Design a protein around this ligand. Structure first.
Ligand code: P0T
Ligand code: P0T
Lengths: 617, 617
C-alpha cells in the first residue's frame, strides 16, 4: 500500500505547492491563485493530487503540522473559496482502495490538534464523511477500524474536547446517532476498537460512559444503546458477539446516581448490612426475544473468553433459575435416552444369526423410530444454526456425534431391511457411539460435570500431531520389518498389517521381541526392533513431558466457567422445546416502573458479600 | 421474598402517609392525627401496614433517611403517644415468615445513624426484640444472621458508639448477657458472623475484645464467656464447632495487661532471653470434662480448617503430652491386633477341606472371640457418636472398616457353625480387610504416619468419576465385541464377562489384540479394539494429567497438621478406655491462684523462639 505521509519518499505545479505547503509559509503561496485562473483549473484536479490515491495539497497541509499548528490551512480555504469551483475541497476524499474516503478532517482529528479541526469546521467542512477504505476495515493486517466517521475517530483516540466540540459546535453538529457503511454507530465503534487489556478497557469504558451522558444531554428522546447495525446488533450484543468482555461487563451492570439515573441497568433495590439486592435490566439479555445476548454468547460468539461471560451477574442468576426450571426436563431427556440405549443394547446382544422373534422385531422397529427421531431432531438443530456451523462445532462436539449415531442406526436398519449382511458392523458402531454419547448428559450433575469438563485437558490437535509422528515411525519400521523378514535362512511380520500390529503392541505393553532364528537377518531385525522400542519410548516420554509442561503451569481453573457455559448452551437449546412441541418461553423478571413512563423488565438478584460490606464500612 | 424497601416498587390513607413519610416533611403530616380519632383507628392496624409483612409507616421512616437524618420520626412518636392505643409502635414487628420480628430499632441501627436510634430509645423503644425471621437465620441463601438482637446488630456491624450507647443509656440498658431464640448471646453471634478472611477476623477480634472489656466494666460478677446456648456451647466451643479458626485462635491465647488481666488465658510465667514460659487456661479445653473443645474439634466440627486447630498452642502441647502418656497403650492395642491377625492368617492358611484339628478349633474360637470383641467395641464407638454419624465417617474411615471386618468374621464363624460352604469367601474377605486395617495403626510412628496421610492425595470422588467414565467405555465396547464376535466366518469374546475381562486387561498391560481369522468381521473387531485402546489411552492420560495438575499447585503441606489431627482423634478415642474398662482421666494441668479468689486449672508451655526474641530486642 502507498504511504499516506512519508518524510523523504517521493510519491504552481504539484511538487512546488506540495513543498511550500509542507513547510507552510503563508506568504510564499502568493502567486498560486492567479495561476488557477488562467488555465481554469482547481485544487482538487487529478494533476494536483497524488493520482493513485487522490491525496490533495490540504491533506499534506494537515499531515505536516508544526507542533499541531499550521499557518497555511486557512490560506488554502481562501483559495478554494475564491477558486471558482462549485464543489469544495474539505469534503474531497481519496480514491485508492486502501484509503477510500479518508478526508482531511480525519487527519486534523488524528493529529490531536483542536486548532486545525476548529479552523476546518468553522470554515465549512463536513463531519459525516465516511472513511471506508481497506485500511479502515477490521480483521486485516495493518488496519485501523475506528468507525469510519470523524466523531468516532475523535472518540476512539481519547480526544475529549474534540468530541464535545464536534457535538457542540454552532456550524455543523455531528450526529451522535449516525452510522458508517457497515451500520455501526459510535458506541458500536467503541466496542469494535476495544481489547481485553485493562487500560484499554478503562479507556473504552470512560469514553462510553461520557458519550452516553452527552447523548442524554444532546439527544434525550432517542436512545443510543437501542440502535442496531446492518447485522442487527446493539452495542451490548456487539460486545457479546465479538468477545470483548470488560466493556460487556461494564454495560451489563451499570449504576449511575442522580440525573443520569435513567441510563443505568443495575438499580439497587435495597441493602441490609452485607446483603444487597439489585434490579438488573433484561433489555434483550434473556432468551425471550429472538436474538439476544444469551443466544449470541452461546451460539454466535467465537472467542476464548466466551465462557467467562456466563460467570458474571445477572447472567449467573438468570441461567441458574432457568436451569432450576428445566433440570426436570433435562433428566427426563436423559431417562428417555437411557431407555433408548437399553433397547439398543438388548436388541444388539440378543441378535440372531445371519414370541421372542416378534419381541425382537418390536425392539427393531422401536430402534428405527428412536433413530429417525434423533436424526430429525439433530437436523432441525443444525438447520436452526445454519448461519454458524463452525460455532455449533467448535465447542458442542456432541451434536455432531448424536447426528452421526442416529444416521448410522437409521442406515443400519435400512441395511437390515435390504437383506445385507453388512448391517451388523453399522449397528455395533451405532451402539458404541450411543454409549459414548451417554456421557453428554453428565453436565446436569455438579461434580461429575465439573470433572467431565476437567478431563479434557489434552488438546485434540496435540493428540493428532503426536499421531502423525507416531504413524510415520510405525509405518517406516513396518515396511522395514516386512522387507527384512521376507526371507528365511509361524513367520512373523509377513504383511505390513501384521507388522503394524506387532509394532503397535509395544505401546500397550504386550510387544514381543526375540532372537528369532527362523529369519536370516535375525540380528538386524532384533537391532531394528530395539531401535523402534528406544525411539518410541523417547517419543511417548517427550509427549508426556511436553504435554504436562503445557498443562501444569498454575493457569486459572476454567472448569466452573466452562461447566456453566455448557449448562447455558443446554438450557438455551432446551428452551425452544423439541422439534414438534415448540414451547413458549417465560418472560423472566417483573415489569417495574423505573424513573421516567419507562417501565423495564427487571430481574432482581439478592447477593451477599462480606468482603464488600466491610470495605464500605 | 418481598423486599423491605424498594425505591420504585409498589407494595391519611396508606399510600398518602407512606409517601409523605418517605419524603419526611414534619408539617405535611398535620391532618393525619384527627383522622385517627374519628374512626377509632391506630397506626399499627393491618390496613395501615403492608399486609403481608406488617411493615408499619415508621419502619418506612427509618428506612428512608435523608443522610441518616429524618425530621419526621419524633412526629410519629407524638402521634402514637397521643393516639389512644394501649400498645406502642416501636415495639411492633413484622409478621411475615421472612422478616419475622424485624422491628424498627433494627433498621435504625442498621442504617448506622446514632441520631435515630438515640431518638428511638430516648423515647421508649425496646432493646431486646428478637428479629427471628428466615432472613435472620444462618446457612440459607440471601440471609443475614446477626444474633437476632439490636445490641448484636450494633456489634456485628462495627458501630462502636451505638454499642456503648445501648449499654450505657439511662433509659433502657441492653442486657449484655441476653439471648436470641436460638440461645446465642452476643459473643456467640460474633462467632457465628465470623469468616476466615483476615480483615473480617480482625473486625470480629476487635469487637470481641472491646465487648469483653465492657462486660468487665458493666457486669463484673457474671462471666460472659461461660454462658451457653441451647446446644450447650460457650463461644470458644462455638468457634471450635463451626470452624472459625482465627477468632478461636484469638480466644485460646489471650493476654491482657493491667485491670483486664483477669480476663486473659495466656498468663506469662517467665521469660529468659529466647525462652518464654506461658500458663494457658484449660477452662473446658481438655478432655476431662464431658463436652469440651478437644472433643468438639475432633468429633463435632465439620470444616476443612479443622486440622489446623490442633496445630496451635496450648492444644499442641496438650495433645503431645497426652500422646506421650498413651503411646504405650496405642502400641499395646497394635500388638493385640497383630496377634489377632496372626491367628486369623494361620487359621485361614491351614484351613481343612470341605491334635492339629483341636488346635485349629482353638484358633477358630479365638477368632470368634476376637471378632465379637471388635464388633462390640465398634458398636459402642458408633453409639457414643450417635449424634454425628457423618463426622465419624468424613475423616475416620477406619472405624467403618473395623466394624465391617468384625461383622464379617462373626458372620463367617456362624456360617461355619451352620455347615454352609459359603463361609470361606467371608473368612477370606475378613482376612483381607484385617490386613488392610493393619494400616490404621501407622499413625503412631512419625515418619510413616506422615507418609500415610501424604499417600492420600487422589480424591475418592476423583477416582469414582473416572470409574464411571471408564465403566461406560468398557461396557459399550464389551457388548460391541460380543455382538460382533457372535458369528464365525477357543472363541474370544463369547460372553460379556469374558469380553469385559479381555478389555480390562489392556489397562494392566496384558491385553492381546490380533487379526483373528476365526471371526467373520475380523477387520471390524480389530479396528474396534484399536479404537478402544486409543480411547482408553487418552482417558487414562487425561486422568493422570488433570489429577497431577490438581495436586501439584504449590499448595501448603497439610500432612503434619492432618497427622496431628489423626493422633488427636486417636488419643481422644483412647482416653475413654475400652468398652469394659472405662478409665478415669487426668485433670491435665496444675491449679493456680491467679488474680481475683479465681483459681484456674492452668497448663504451662515452655517455648523458645529465636525469631520472636530478636524482634522484641
Ligand atoms: C529403554 C531404555 C534403554 C531407556 C528407558 C527409559 C528412557 C526414556 C530412556 C530409554 C533410552 C531410549 O529410549 C533411547 C536412548 C538413545 C536415543 C535413541 C535416539 C538417538 C537411550 C535411552 O536410555
Ligand atoms: C497409541 C497411540 C497411537 C498414542 C499413544 C500415546 C498418546 C496418549 C496418544 C495415543 C493416541 C490416542 O490414544 C488417540 C488418538 C486419536 C484420538 C481418538 C479420539 C478421537 C491419537 C493418538 O496419538
Amino acid at each position: 500500500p502507498p504511504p499516506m505521509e512519508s518524510p523523504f519518499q517521493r510519491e504552481f505545479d504539484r511538487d512546488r505547492l506540495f513543498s511550500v505547503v509542507s513547510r507552510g509559509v503563508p506568504e510564499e503561496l502568493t502567486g498560486l491563485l492567479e495561476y488557477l485562473r488562467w488555465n481554469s483549473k482547481y485544487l482538487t484536479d487529478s494533476a494536483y493530487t497524488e493520482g493513485s490515491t487522490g491525496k490533495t495539497c490540504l491533506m499534506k497541509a494537515v499531515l505536516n503540522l508544526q507542533d499541531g499548528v499550521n499557518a497555511c490551512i486557512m490560506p488554502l480555504l481562501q483559495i478554494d473559496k475564491d477558486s471558482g469551483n462549485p464543489k469544495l475541497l474539505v469534503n474531497a476524499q481519496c480514491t485508492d482502495e486502501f484509503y477510500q474516503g479518508h478526508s482531511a478532517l480525519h487527519i486534523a482529528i488524528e493529529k490531536r490538534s483542536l486548532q486545525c479541526v476548529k479552523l476546518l469546521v468553522e470554515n465549512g467542512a463536513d463531519v459525516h464523511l465516511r472513511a471506508c477504505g481497506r485500511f479502515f476495515q477490521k480483521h486485516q493486517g495493518t488496519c485501523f477500524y475506528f468507525g469510519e466517521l470523524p466523531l468516532s475517530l475523535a472518540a476512539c483516540t481519547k480526544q475529549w474536547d474534540v468530541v464535545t466540540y464536534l457535538l457542540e459546535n454552532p456550524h455543523q453538529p455531528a450526529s451522535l446517532e449516525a452510522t458508517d457503511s457497515l451500520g455501526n454507530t459510535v458506541l458500536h465503534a467503541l466496542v469494535m476498537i476495544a481489547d481485553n487489556s485493562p487500560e484499554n478497557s478503562a479507556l473504552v469504558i470512560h469514553m462510553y460512559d461520557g458519550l452516553l451522558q452527552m447523548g442524554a444531554r444532546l439527544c434525550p428522546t432517542v436512545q443510543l444503546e437501542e440502535i442496531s447495525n446492518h447485522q442487527g446488533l446493539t452495542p451490548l450484543k456487539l460486545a457479546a458477539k465479538e468477545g470483548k468482555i470488560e466493556i460487556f461487563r461494564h454495560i451489563l451492570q451499570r449504576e449511575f446516581s442522580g440525573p443520569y439515573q435513567p441510563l443505568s441497568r443495575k438499580f439497587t433495590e435495597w441493602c441490609y448490612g452485607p446483603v444487597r439486592v439489585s434490579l438488573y435490566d433484561l433489555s434483550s439479555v434473556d432468551s425471550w426475544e429472538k436474538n439476544s445476548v444469551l443466544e449470541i454468547i452461546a451460539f454466535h460468539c467465537k472467542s476464548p473468553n466466551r465462557h467467562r461471560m456466563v460467570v458474571l451477574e445477572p447472567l449467573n442468576k438468570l441461567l441458574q433459575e432457568k436451569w432450576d426450571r428445566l433440570v426436570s426436563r433435562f433428566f427426563f431427556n436423559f431417562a428417555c435416552y437411557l431407555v433408548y440405549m437399553f433397547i439398543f443394547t438388548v436388541v444388539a446382544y440378543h441378535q440372531p444369526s445371519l414370541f421372542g422373534e416378534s419381541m425382537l422385531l418390536l425392539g427393531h422397529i422401536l430402534i428405527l423410530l428412536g433413530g429417525i427421531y434423533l436424526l430429525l431432531g439433530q437436523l432441525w438443530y443444525f438447520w436452526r444454526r445454519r448461519l454458524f456451523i463452525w460455532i455449533s462445532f467448535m465447542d458442542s462436539y456432541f451434536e455432531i456425534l448424536f447426528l452421526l449415531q442416529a444416521l448410522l442406526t437409521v442406515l443400519s436398519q435400512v441395511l437390515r431391511f435390504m437383506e445385507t449382511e453388512w448391517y451388523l458392523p453399522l449397528l455395533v458402531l451405532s451402539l458404541v457411539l450411543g454409549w459414548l454419547n451417554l456421557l453428554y448428559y453428565t453436565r446436569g450433575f455438579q461434580h461429575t460435570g465439573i470433572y467431565s469438563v476437567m478431563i479434557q485437558k489434552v488438546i485434540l490437535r496435540d493428540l493428532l500431531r503426536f499421531l502423525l509422528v507416531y504413524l510415520v515411525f510405525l509405518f517406516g519400521f513396518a515396511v522395514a520389518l516386512v522387507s527384512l523378514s521376507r526371507e528365511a535362512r509361524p513367520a512373523p511380520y509377513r504383511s505390513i498389517l501384521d507388522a503394524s500390529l506387532e509394532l503397535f503392541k509395544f505401546t500397550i505393553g504386550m510387544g514381543e521381541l526375540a532372537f528369532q532364528e527362523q529369519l536370516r537377518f535375525r540380528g538386524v531385525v532384533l537391532l531394528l526392533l530395539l531401535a523402534y522400542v528406544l525411539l518410541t519410548y523417547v517419543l511417548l516420554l517427550n509427549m508426556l513431558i511436553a504435554l504436562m509442561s503445557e498443562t501444569v503451569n498454575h493457569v486459572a481453573d476454567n472448569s466452573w466457567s466452562i461447566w456453566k457455559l455448557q449448562k447455558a448452551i443446554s438450557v438455551l437449546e432446551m428452551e425452544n422445546g423439541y422439534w414438534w412441541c415448540r414451547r413458549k418461553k417465560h418472560r423472566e423478571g417483573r415489569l417495574l416502573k423505573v424513573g421516567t413512563p419507562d417501565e423495564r423488565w427487571c430481574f432482581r438478584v439478592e447477593e451477599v458479600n462480606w468482603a464488600a460490606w466491610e470495605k464500605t464500612l
